[PDB]
């Protein structure tokens, strides 16, 4: 054949730290369907937002938003443990159906995105060239995000542990922990991997008595 009807750009969803995760690759023939299992970003997260994106960039913010919906009622669990199956199905009319289902709770939500949605022909070409020009930067970004996400997880577990510790935690330690949490927060907004890892360390150094407390029966 000299003509194939295809989805012109990659389609996927936003995942923790502003990353596009692709479910259907650019230039896939239609009709087509693919599924991938995702999980929660934080301990005891009760809901997830499925932000649907079209484009080739690894930074979610530089792709085209097609829609979003939420799925709630996720039962309490450690982050990473719930199984949220997300399915993209593009039919022969180019209509995109996106669903998310939590395997433990059985709850599901879906949206339908009409075929005219997303980028036009001129924006499609610009997008492909944009991603080609930014391929190395986007590699660096994904590295930065793995470190940001560790940073983010430590900040949350530490805050949870301070709450649970309450007045068992000495006043000098809480002050030092508070400062170090704020510092980690600030670093996480920059693009410097070493700076994040550095504040993670500074937080750990003031956290020994806390770790001891969290650890006992």
């Amino acid at each position: 054949v000299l003509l194939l009807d295809v989805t012109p750009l990659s389609l996927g969803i936003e995942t923790m730290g502003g990353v596009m995760t692709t479910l259907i690759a650019k230039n896939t023939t239609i009709p087509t369907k693919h599924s991938q299992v995702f999980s929660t970003a934080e301990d005891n997260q009760s809901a997830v937002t499925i932000h649907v994106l079209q484009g080739e960039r690894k930074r979610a913010a530089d792709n085209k938003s097609l829609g979003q919906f939420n799925l709630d009622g996720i039962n309490p669990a450690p982050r990473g443990m719930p199984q949220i199956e997300v399915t993209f199905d593009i039919d022969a009319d180019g209509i995109l159906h996106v669903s998310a289902k939590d395997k433990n709770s059985g709850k599901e939500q879906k949206i339908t995105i009409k075929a005219s949605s997303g980028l036009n022909e001129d924006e499609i070409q610009k997008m492909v060239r944009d991603a080609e020009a930014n391929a190395e930067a986007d590699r660096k970004f994904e590295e930065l995000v793995q470190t940001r996400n560790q940073g983010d997880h430590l900040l949350h577990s530490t805050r949870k542990q301070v709450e649970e510790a309450g007045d068992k935690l000495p006043a000098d330690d809480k002050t030092a922990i508070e400062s170090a949490l704020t510092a980690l927060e600030t670093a996480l907004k920059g693009e410097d991997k070493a700076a994040i890892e550095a504040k993670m360390q500074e937080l750990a150094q003031v956290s020994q008595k806390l770790m001891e407390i969290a650890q006992q029966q």
């Binding site: 936003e14 923790m16 809901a47 990473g80």
Partner: peptide, 13 residues
Amino acid sequence: PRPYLPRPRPPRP
């Protein structure tokens, strides 16, 4: 293994 999803945005602070 699985990639992680963000939570819905709460009301503005």
